């Protein structure tokens, strides 16, 4: 590796060299930069809706919004700092953008501060058992935002209620809005509560003077599903500027390679994204952003 003459002697395996021409190596231009292009991320789902909904459903009547066929930037919520608690199971919150999912649901409801501990896999309580239960294999996410300055009312917000007693425990993601009187004894309740009978639902005491444990918390549960069906929702992909006339590594929306990109005069069709040579080799591409 000192000089080309010495590289000759190593190839020929001779300390002496005769007159002529000898091949010794293979020159190759190493890539300098790396291009990454990906089309715009328009048509985002309104994930801010459930996080900042004008009105929330009750706990026993927990609503659900489906999220699919869109790009969902999960790092916006993580870095938004508009929440009281945030915790994801199985996958970190900053890493969800690198994943694709078949279906994602948003179960929104409001609870007290101390009741947030029950929303997690393997928990039990008034909320976990009779109102809203999660499976032990829950690998979703849970976000909580204190709404004491928003949802509390003088005398308690009676529009938000929850179940205190039930004849049996709920299942994962089960919902029940029945007003059946919880029976304990053998006698019939006759539709009214009392001795060994109790109306299971009760209203919340969300007043402006509540504490950290009793104040209202706008909670949303984000469960992710990976099924046989193809992915309908994914995170956003990064992009950069467009380099030209320089050897780089290509990473387009669905293509990879290495070569010198340069303008051309080819005429693609409107629904034609990339090209091929006579030997099925790539020789031209359309930028995902600019046509």
């Amino acid at each position: 590796a000192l000089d080309p003459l010495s590289e000759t002697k190593c190839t020929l395996k001779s300390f002496t060299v005769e007159k002529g021409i000898y091949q010794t190596s293979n020159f190759r231009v190493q890539p300098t930069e790396s291009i990454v292009r990906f089309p715009n991320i328009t048509n985002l789902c309104p994930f801010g809706e459930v996080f900042n909904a004008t009105r929330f459903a009750s706990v026993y009547a927990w609503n659900r919004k489906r999220i699919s066929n869109c790009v969902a930037d999960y790092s916006v919520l993580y870095n938004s700092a508009s929440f009281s608690t945030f915790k994801c199971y199985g996958v970190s919150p900053t890493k969800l953008n690198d994943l694709c999912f078949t279906n994602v649901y948003a179960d929104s409801f409001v609870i007290r501060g101390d009741e947030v501990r029950q929303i997690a896999p393997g928990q039990t309580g008034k909320i976990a058992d009779y109102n809203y239960k999660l499976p032990d294999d829950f690998t979703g996410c849970v976000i909580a935002w204190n709404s004491n300055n928003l949802d509390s009312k003088v005398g308690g917000n009676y529009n938000y209620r929850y179940r205190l007693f039930r004849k049996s425990n709920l299942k994962p993601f089960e919902r029940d809005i029945s007003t059946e009187i919880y029976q304990a004894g053998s006698k019939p309740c006759n539709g009214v509560e009392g001795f060994n009978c109790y109306f299971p639902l009760q209203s919340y005491g969300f007043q402006p003077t509540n504490g950290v444990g009793y104040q209202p918390y706008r909670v949303v549960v984000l469960s992710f599903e990976l099924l046989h069906a193809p992915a309908t929702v994914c995170g956003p992909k990064k992009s950069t500027n467009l380099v030209k006339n320089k050897c780089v590594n290509f990473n387009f929306n669905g293509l990879t390679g290495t070569g010198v990109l340069t303008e051309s005069n080819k005429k693609f069709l409107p629904f034609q994204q990339f090209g091929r040579d006579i030997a099925d080799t790539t020789d031209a591409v359309r930028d995902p952003q600019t046509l």
Partner: protein, 262 residues
């Protein structure tokens, strides 16, 4: 809901030969001045295609199979064909893919449509203040995932009869859950409702549906001035895809100009 067109009589399954029709771009790849082979689902040349007629009692609207994929050659004057149905049971039991054209824009939906016995997108009092707009193809639907709308368009909903000057050919294929669609529009001179010659079909929309489809049905519109409605002149065809091998002659501008069935 349950009542159907009592003035409906089914014609026998006539057949005609498809000379060189039904060739589409199997991929979004550009190729210039070459001749490439490809093994995919195509319509074999000079095959038989089921003829169908939709006019007031020669009005055909049966349920066909959709095992491998089919074709349409929709040529008409009154724009009777407004959309299609695709599904296994075509009721609330299984999911069903719905495509409709309401004379202002195309709309695609996947819901548990409990379809009627004789669904149609009709219009009534088409004499004054028509405005070219729709004026109940299913009874109920719930728990559904997909919705889509493309660019708008204007359709003529007036009752007319005569010769046709337009051919709108379509293809429908299920690609590993993706419901791919191809289409083309060209002027014609009507002969037997099956114009001839070669023309390539371009991709229109890709749809991640994921439904296991086995049947389909047309939404033939009806009009009057469901049991006693009229309909203008219209006809169409139905093909059947098969796993053939084809050559594709691309020109300089990436356009396919000829083909060969191997």
């Amino acid at each position: 809901q349950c009542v159907n067109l009592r003035t409906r009589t089914q014609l026998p399954p006539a057949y005609t030969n498809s000379f060189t029709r039904g060739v589409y771009y199997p991929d979004k790849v550009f190729r210039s001045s070459v001749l490439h082979s490809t093994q995919d689902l195509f319509l074999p040349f000079f095959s038989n295609v089921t003829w169908f007629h939709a006019i007031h009692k020669r009005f055909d609207n049966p349920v066909l199979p959709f095992n491998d994929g089919v074709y349409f050659a929709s040529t008409e004057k009154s724009n009777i064909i407004r959309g299609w149905i695709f599904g296994t049971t075509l009721d609330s039991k299984t999911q069903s893919l719905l495509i409709v054209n309401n004379a202002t824009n195309v709309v695609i939906k996947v819901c548990e449509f409990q379809f009627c016995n004789d669904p149609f997108l009709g219009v009534y009092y088409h004499k004054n203040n028509k405005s070219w707009m729709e004026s109940g193809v299913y009874s109920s639907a719930n728990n559904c995932t997909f919705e889509y709308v493309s660019q708008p368009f204007l359709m003529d909903l007036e009752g007319k009869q005569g010769n046709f000057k337009n051919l709108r050919e379509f293809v429908f294929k299920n690609i590993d859950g993706y419901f791919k669609i191809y289409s083309k529009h060209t002027p014609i001179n009507l002969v037997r409702d099956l114009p001839q010659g070669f023309s390539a079909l371009e991709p229109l929309v890709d749809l991640p549906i994921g439904i296991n489809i086995t049947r389909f049905q047309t939404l033939l519109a009806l009009h009057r001035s469901s049991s006693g409605w009229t309909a203008g002149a219209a006809a169409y065809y139905v093909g059947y895809l098969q796993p053939r091998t084809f050559l594709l002659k691309y020109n300089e501008n990436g356009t396919i100009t000829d083909a060969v069935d191997c």
